Design a binder for this molecule. Structure first.
Ligand SMILES: [Co+2]
Ligand SMILES: [Co+2]
Ligand SMILES: [Co+2]
Ligand SMILES: [Co+2]
Lengths: 329, 329
């Protein structure tokens, strides 16, 4: 009945309005520490991030879940710093993303399980800060290594009650194989969110997962490259569908009986080193609201379309709490 | 005049007997910090390192060059720590190895140059410790990225007079492509060591490079998997030829008249996460002498084969000093 944050455990009520897939900095292990000038400076990155969280907070956001893993450039100390400065809860992640180093790629499923358990039960690095979620990733059919990561995440979840959240290629219908591997590990679908699921309009894929009891992460709502057509990065990054097209999936799933399975987010960041050098400026030009995009634009959008207050509050408050609070079922 | 160490700048004369290609911990960026228990613990790894350095110090070694890069898992405060406790100088490296993460893979040669210069002129991370060497790597034909890294290294070298050392697949004669690229950038061969050159029986390859002004890194002398040939990890890493065979190349280059171009080392480590998980113990079993193998085994071996004392001292003292002391030529 307690969710771990970068400032300690909080109760369920304290979580409140939660964004379930966000980042402070999108990068690689040690990159921020080794080359902060890439982000202007570590101080500039911090100030940017604090200003963003304060705006999100003014918009009603109380908690975010930072789903940056070790190899995804998680700097937990930075997460801790910005959290106290903005008074926004940040839940830190363990697991692995799509770019694990050789030191991880050579590990067994038993060692991977030990490491995830470390970051959950013991602490991240030497900070004593505990991960509150496990993040895994595939882009298309799982590699032999990604099979181990997924099995290991399932095992860490089953041992702690901490949930698993995923990065997918929705077009490749990644969730159907992620689901198959998790259920073979005996992991409850109620402990899993299949993310990036808003990247496609394939509703039959989404309700199949939602029917099994998975959580559906519609977590890139503001992502759109419309207007920035010839920008290579922004197109592979954000695709061609409008934000209103991504947000309609929320109503569509509400209308098929699955509002209790919907988690919503921006997948926003304040630093991003994994594309063209200036990808953060380009994303900022697309979404000047940042993390406040969900509460300022998406929530009113759905209200205008007839979705009651009661249902919206359930998606952004009740759903993340049920999901994040440690349990096996 | 001076060389950058992890304990600050030193006069050339303090360098003494220098091992020019070693490691404290061969890992991935942030890996020791995130998962210290892979190595027993950070303390255990540090004590093991300090034990090893002291033993090499008793054997005559005064300075090592640690050529772990960012992606090689360089932990520069660990290096400093073991340096102070064992009283052995340690020159730290910039550059990139064969495992750069995505945030590095996506950078341009001008960005890469910015990074290497960062770690030389400014410092590594936030430690104030400055690199005194640039390490780069190829494995057969340079990938498009590796081409950028080598060019970036040459430009950084040309800006600071700090030298470049390389990992190669010697049997593929990588030294020839590396050199062609280095020279296209206007970098003097006297600021470049072609490492891992003892992996080949082809002395023509070596003397051609030495004749061009290059230093030749006979830097893996204790490496051998004879007696454990069915250990796949050790075989790929260490090969199937004895240490004497590796050591006899030093004499062949000496007899050819190129003692001025030779640098010897062990390529030893105290921690190793980049292979099967116990690779370090397997290596310790093959070479209990560790970093003291060069002074304790290789030097008396070559003295016994009729190499003068002034030649062995010139290779382990003079050549490293002339290499590391900052110059463009
Ligand atoms: Co993702
Ligand atoms: Co994300
Ligand atoms: Co090497
Ligand atoms: Co090496």
């Amino acid at each position: 009945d307690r969710i771990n944050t970068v400032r300690g455990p909080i109760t369920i009520s304290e979580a409140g309005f939660t964004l379930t897939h966000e980042h402070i900095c999108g990068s690689s292990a040690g990159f921020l520490r080794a080359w902060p000038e890439f982000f202007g400076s570590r101080k500039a990155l911090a100030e940017k991030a604090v200003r963003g969280l304060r705006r999100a907070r003014a918009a009603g956001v109380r908690t975010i879940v930072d789903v940056s893993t070790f190899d995804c450039g998680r700097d937990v100390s930075l997460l801790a710093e910005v959290s106290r400065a903005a008074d926004v809860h940040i839940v830190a992640a363990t697991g692995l993303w799509v770019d694990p180093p050789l030191s991880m790629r050579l590990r067994s499923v038993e060692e991977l399980t030990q490491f995830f358990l470390r970051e959950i039960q013991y602490g991240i690095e030497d900070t004593g800060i505990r991960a509150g979620i496990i993040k895994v990733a595939t882009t298309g059919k799982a590699t032999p290594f990604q099979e181990l990561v997924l099995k290991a995440a399932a095992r860490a979840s089953l041992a702690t009650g901490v949930p698993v959240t995923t990065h997918t290629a929705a077009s490749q219908r990644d969730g159907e194989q992620q689901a198959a591997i998790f259920e073979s590990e005996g992991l409850s679908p109620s402990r899993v969110c299949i993310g990036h699921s808003d990247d496609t309009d394939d509703l039959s894929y989404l309700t199949a997962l939602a029917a099994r009891g998975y959580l559906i992460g519609l977590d890139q709502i503001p992502y759109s490259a419309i207007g920035l057509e010839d920008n290579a990065s922004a197109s592979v990054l954000m695709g061609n569908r409008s934000w209103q097209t991504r947000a309609l999936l929320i109503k569509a799933l509400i209308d098929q009986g699955y509002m209790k399975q919907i988690l919503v987010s921006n997948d926003w960041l304040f630093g991003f080193s994994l594309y063209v050098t200036n990808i953060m400026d380009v994303m900022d030009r697309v979404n000047p609201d940042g993390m406040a995009f969900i509460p300022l634009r998406v929530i009113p959008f759905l209200r205008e379309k007839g979705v009651p207050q009661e249902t919206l509050a359930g998606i952004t408050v009740t759903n993340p709490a049920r999901f994040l609070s440690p349990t096996l079922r």
